[PDB]
Design a protein around this ligand. Structure first.
Ligand SMILES: *C(=O)C(CC)(CC)C(=O)Nc1cccc(CN2CCN(Cc3cccc4cccnc34)CC2)c1
Ligand SMILES: *C(=O)C(CC)(CC)C(=O)Nc1cccc(CN2CCN(Cc3cccc4cccnc34)CC2)c1
Lengths: 843, 844
């Protein structure tokens, strides 16, 4: 019956509430160990079965370092073993003073907040570790022949004569004496033992005008990093070969060569604000030119002493653009484990057609200006050498790039490739298939200019067995992977089989496809890392009510029944923090829309709730593709401010409407070509359901708040439902889809020329006449340095608001990119949110 | 008791502001300007003169070239309104969507030009040639002279070019109007307008793809020169031809500034095409950092009797500019003597406390060459009696204000001396006219021998220095003000504050027998005048606080034997004063004496329909910076209608010209030296407290402070230093960190940062955010995103500091505006926002 009134605090009152909420949280940000490597110990006398390597922030450190824990052979059943974190590196400052533009932008794109060592490459046979640290390259050795340290060793720096940063370092799998890196947009190798360095590619001239120097080798460009989650542009061949009678060893690297010549240039302000300068970006806006791309092959020869004797740039016998004319993007690439084939995952520009293509090294010839030498090379390419399209995925929705492709070893003289593949477009749910392609030879004259027909290189599919099926998903994106045991014929995977609210670890046979066994405990969402010996796994898991823990599990039982190996709790890497007394978990619910679609939501109930009270409500919204807000995992680290709102007496509602992920392609596909037009309808149905079910929602006092897609929908809510939403707080909103990039926008909306109606309807800056004529209903927030949702979106929205004579409030975070990382900015944002709601969320 | 302003809806405030601004859009940029008088030489015709000018008549959406006919006789008992005749037949001078090239766009911003169309023209009276920019190209037309006077609009002929990109700063050759000059891609060109021959004279710009590796320009005024020294050209035609060639060839000369910006810091400012998401690069000398390396050079070319360009030559000083003039940081001004015998330059040191006027004979310049032997031969051939002459030197412990008045007389006494009129402020601390005679005595120099000049090298003996004016008032010599000299009558016409600092008047004094100064303009108005070169007629553009501007033509009439006492007789009107709206109430000017016994002027907009015993919420509208006077007897309804609008809603509006403001002498302006922020607020608070005591209707518990640029800076300073005086601040385009501002402005008033760490720290509001309010809705920041003078950086940095100090703030940005709000939608939104912020938050 009655309306609850939030206590109005002074600004300094709100500062103390926010500072207190964070400072006395009873939770620490990014404390979990990660990037796990299991190594077996081979001392029968010793007490430890394994050493476990990982990245983590040890006790009395402010930065990530390389750590190990000892896994004992036996544990007391009636006792909880907390593994001690041992340092690998002796008192070593990995972080630079107070990063370069290259390292800074990479941390923004990989969503990395923590300081210090953020990744390492590891070679198990040799026990070599390789990593970036102190704006240089370092390495150390542990296990293998050398044996296991019992105290922190000092990491050996790798000296260079190169100018500028050495990026994306990787150990050569065939010979760990060698590693690769990118320097000034070109691929280099070095011998880590001898210290010899050698440039392999010569794309980057190093010209004074950078915009006249538009080619790179081995580099993932802006859209590939930001929209396709690929951070490398080169891949070591896993094997050596032995061509020529001189006894030389050949090592190979597949790399993407890019030319950004025709790609539009935008300027984004640089983080040194006092310098009043911008950085230049090759930013493909929707409908404009993406980079020109090709796959190429770098080869070098080595003697028995490890000297680099010769190097060669090799390219496809006919141009990439001739062989693969419909390919806009290379999503992924790699090699078969025998090095027999390079492979690439190719996408068309509409992102409705994917090909998995094998490329034999024999299809690549030496790069040359000499047309006669090139023709001699092309004449020598055998007729039986060709690309093989071993898999093709087609959809009328869009291809989500799935990272799961596992090719099995071939027999000698076998013209088939068996592989595991995650495929969503077949059933509309991402599932594991065992595929057998026949490598069909047509015979090709590579000396003639090439024009591929329909189904050029297309391999017959002899067999395609569903290992999984149903209205749930195998997780195949954004870090999710499979692990394959070829001894037991088992594939381990993560999925939503038990519930869309929880990630679980599962195992199924790929030989006798049948029973799926769950390996993780229901009531938690799990993120797992499996030992390459399939004897142990780590689970990073949480629930809405329980902060995250990291536990080590032993897979135990008879070796003759590997599918039914039992997960046994073994030891803890990190115990769950106490759920704070001031923190009240949200409650997950579900409802059916008027169209009988099931939606999940969660509610943060006003704290110390009294009956007969209607409370002012904040609808917290993301609502975009590739994200699920509502699941059974701990929200108090990333979304503490929602608990803070509930503590002051706001109800907080979160709805996963149509367009959100982990519900299949059809569910996500509801927003195709009509972003903005359907998401608000589901949000309002959720709000009305929560009001009817729970009874404490004041529908006369609803705020809408979100960031990025959530900022976009906050403005759309005020435009389409001005009687529902009293106020909107729009953080980093997309306001004009024509200003957003190719990779994201075209996937969901097509190009502007093909979807004028959708682009117009979905661009909030073109509908400012429908925004409120009353002041204090709209707050816009934006990081000045945002390289994803450019400040331009807010600038253009403001320009339109002025033209339409509409009021607005604005806050800028001058030192922030897309997400607020600095504590002062984060606190100021939260204080501003509390102040805006207390002053302006009224009936 | 407390008056409460009526609370309106946002759309209510939009209606009030939209209604108010109909009047301003009727009168703003309506005045004709850039006047040229030409006498008619036809006794049969009814007109004594044709008067050319720029104007936007009612209906037109752009400025065009116009003329009016001045009749020989007028009815004494009738007011003649002159007809505005078009020169150009249905011609769009404005480009498509009013989108100018970056060069033309930035020049309009720096010259404060609001109108579209033709904004300037070059005129050659003998030939009747007009030359002007239009439609991102160059045009010309002819009228008067040999050709005779048009009776209907002619079509302007475009000048064809093979040059790529804009042709900037076009000028007619005074010696030969067949030739004109222009700048193309940072180099000086000349062209023959009759033949169409074009020739590049300078080769500073390599045209490299990396622009930052291409840092030299010729003929160009750089960023600080345009923004802070009010100079928009970097070259000067020699007014005469010479004939030193024995093939009967004619030599024409151009003096030009060559600059090297190699060492100057680079900043990026967003470009006005927001959707392109790009910036333009600027060579921005921040205070304490490097200015451009500069030199004066000489471009020569030879022409035959048929007007063909036979040859060209780049010439430079026989010893480097940096050797001859080692303490010179800036070229303020340059030109020639009327006979072309000497180039001259006005040089400033880096502290801007030492100015030199220097003659440079063309003989001191030798051909540019890489060949060291040829250079030494050239240097040896320079006569020993050729040298620079420092004819005048101004020194001060305050600062040099660059005065545009330097009038060299022809050398009618002989070659040993130069007589000149000069405006000088540092001598008495008030800007006054002096007649100076310098002695030009050759020391004898071997120019092939290197020499480092000592103190007072080239310094001329001063034979005579007569004060033509004196007292505690100013001759106006800056920002458009000039003198006119009639050498027949020995009279100099000037504008000044002799009658009152509140009014500009036209005056005349003899430079032969300096004595009585005669005022030619009517008291009770401030006048802006244009004098005929024949001294028979003048125009006055004039207004008062109560009367909108009019433009009247006056005849100077009376006996020719007594020219000093010629009567100004009203002849005709170019523009009558508009009717004021009924709800426009003029502000009231007052003065008061500070506790230190300094007289300060202010004005008050009284709340409309004021009732006694009521205290009203108050807006202190502030600029408070150097080079500006807000309080004078001129019409404020064009630029400051919004102050009347505030008064109509029941706000009191107060304006105080504190110490630091101009038109009160160097000592008064000098009060803020090395301590910007620290004295201006004290005077603002004394003014406010005086107005509250004198007028009795000021609620001192409800005062807002509001200003733009220096006024934005002082709005923040008021909130920091006087938080109990100012309930709210609205800070527009504030300077928040003086260390981020430029060399020319900041060093003049504040020295370099290393010499004035205390003053820079105390005056930088972004470094004192801890003292800004912990209560919301006391601070509104406004800034144009594209501001190329007060960079958005100032607001961005202030916000970054406010966040770190945990302070609340409100922010509005004008994404499509540079420094000043030019778009009507932006202007309306600003004024609506101002009224909303005051109605909601100016309380208690
Ligand atoms: C704003 O909404 C934009 C721009 C930044 C689009 C307008 C946006 O969000 N774009 C976008 C691009 C690529 C991928 C995504 C979705 N990812 C967001 C980050 N997320 C990491 C993550 C979050 C929660 C839990 C979790 C658990 C395991 C691994 N990762 C995560 C992955 C999805 C959005
Ligand atoms: C802001 O205050 C800054 C930055 C834009 C300094 C922080 C500023 O104002 N700078 C500045 C630089 C050079 C010269 C000036 C002073 N001029 C301003 C324009 N003004 C034209 C003018 C205005 C009103 C009346 C009037 C009457 C006759 C002639 N001109 C004018 C001339 C002075 C400021």
């Amino acid at each position: 019956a009655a309306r609850f009134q939030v206590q109005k605090h002074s600004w300094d009152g709100l500062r103390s509430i926010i500072h207190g909420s964070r400072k006395y949280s009873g939770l620490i940000v990014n404390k979990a160990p990660h990037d796990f490597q299991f190594v077996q110990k081979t001392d029968e006398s010793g007490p430890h079965s394994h050493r476990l390597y990982y990245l983590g922030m040890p006790y009395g450190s402010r930065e990530n370092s390389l750590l190990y824990s000892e896994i004992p052979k036996k544990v007391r059943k009636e006792a909880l073993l907390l593994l001690s974190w041992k340092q690998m590196l002796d008192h070593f400052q990995a972080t630079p003073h107070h990063y370069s533009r290259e390292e800074e932008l990479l941390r923004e794109r990989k969503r990395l907040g923590v300081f210090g060592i953020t990744s390492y490459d590891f070679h198990s046979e040799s026990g070599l570790f390789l990593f970036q640290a102190s704006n240089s390259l370092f390495h150390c050795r542990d296990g293998g022949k050398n044996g296991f340290m019992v105290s922190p060793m000092k990491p050996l720096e790798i000296k260079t004569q190169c100018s500028g940063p050495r990026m994306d370092p990787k150990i050569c799998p065939a010979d760990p004496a060698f590693f690769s890196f990118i320097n000034n947009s070109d691929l280099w190798v070095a011998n880590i033992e001898t210290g010899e360095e050698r440039r392999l590619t010569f794309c980057h001239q190093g010209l004074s005008n950078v915009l006249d120097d538009p080619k790179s080798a081995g580099v993932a460009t802006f859209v590939i990093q930001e929209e396709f989650d690929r951070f490398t542009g080169y891949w070591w061949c896993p094997t050596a070969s032995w061509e020529g009678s001189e006894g030389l060893k050949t090592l190979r690297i597949l790399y993407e060569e890019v030319d950004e010549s025709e790609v539009e240039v935008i300027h984004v302000p640089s983080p040194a604000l006092e310098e009043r300068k911008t950085d230049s970006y090759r930013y493909p806006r929707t409908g404009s030119k993406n980079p020109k791309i090709a796959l190429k092959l770098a080869e070098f020869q080595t003697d028995s002493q490890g000297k680099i004797v010769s190097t060669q740039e090799k390219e496809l016998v006919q141009p990439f653009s001739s062989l693969f004319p419909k390919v806009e993007y290379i999503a992924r690439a790699g090699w078969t484990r025998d090095g027999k084939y390079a492979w690439a995952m190719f996408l068309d520009r509409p992102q409705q057609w994917l090909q998995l293509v094998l490329l034999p090294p024999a299809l690549f010839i030496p790069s040359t200006e000499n047309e006669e030498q090139r023709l001699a090379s092309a004449r020598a390419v055998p007729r039986n050498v060709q690309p093989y399209v071993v898999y093709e995925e087609v959809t009328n929705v869009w291809i989500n790039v799935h990272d799961i492709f596992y090719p099995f070893p071939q027999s000698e003289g076998e013209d088939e490739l068996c592989f595991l593949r995650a495929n969503e477009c077949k059933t509309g749910f991402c599932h594991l298939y065992k595929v057998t392609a026949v490598l069909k030879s047509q015979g090709y004259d590579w000396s003639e200019p090439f024009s591929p027909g329909e189904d050029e290189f297309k391999c017959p599919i002899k067999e395609e067995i569903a290992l999984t099926s149903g209205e749930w998903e195998v997780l195949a994106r954004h870090g999710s992977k499979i692990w394959v045991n070829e001894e037991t014929k088992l594939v381990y995977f993560q999925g939503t089989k038990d519930t869309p609210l929880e990630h679980h670890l599962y195992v199924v046979s790929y030989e006798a496809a049948g029973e799926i066994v769950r390996l993780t405990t229901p009531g938690f969402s799990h993120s797992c890392s499996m030992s390459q010996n399939f004897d142990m796994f780590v689970s990073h898991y949480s629930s809405v009510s329980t902060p995250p823990c990291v536990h080590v599990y032993k897979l135990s039982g008879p070796d003759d029944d590997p599918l039914h190996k039992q997960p046994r709790f073994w030891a803890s890497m990190m115990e769950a923090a106490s759920c704070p007394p001031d923190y009240v978990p949200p409650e997950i619910f579900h409802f059916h829309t008027r169209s009988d679609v099931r939606l999940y939501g969660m509610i943060y109930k006003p704290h110390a709730l009294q009956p007969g009270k209607k409370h002012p409500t904040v609808l917290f919204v993301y609502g975009g593709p590739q994200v699920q807000l509502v699941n059974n995992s701990f929200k108090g680290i990333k979304y503490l401010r929602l608990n803070t709102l509930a503590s002051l007496g706001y109800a907080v509602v979160v709805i996963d409407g149509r367009g959100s992920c982990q519900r299949g392609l059809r569910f996500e596909g509801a927003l195709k070509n009509q972003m903005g037009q359907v998401e608000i309808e589901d949000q309002v149905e959720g709000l009305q359901f929560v009001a009817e079910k729970y009874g404490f929602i004041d529908l006369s006092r609803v705020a809408i708040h979100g960031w990025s897609y959530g900022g976009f929908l906050s403005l759309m809510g005020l435009i389409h439902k001005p009687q529902v939403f009293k106020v909107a707080i729009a953080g980093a909103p997309v306001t004009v889809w024509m200003a957003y990039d190719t990779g994201y926008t075209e996937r969901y909306m097509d190009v502007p020329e093909n979807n004028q109606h959708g682009y117009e309807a979905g661009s909030v800056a073109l509908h400012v006449e429908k925004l409120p004529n009353e002041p204090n209903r709209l707050l816009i927030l934006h990081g000045f340095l945002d390289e994803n949702v450019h400040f331009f979106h807010t600038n253009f929205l403001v320009s339109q608001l002025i033209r339409a004579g509409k009021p607005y409030q604005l806050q800028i975070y001058p030192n922030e990119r897309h997400s607020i990382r600095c504590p002062e900015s984060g606190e100021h944002y939260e204080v501003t949110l509390l102040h805006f709601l207390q002053e302006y969320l009224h009936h």
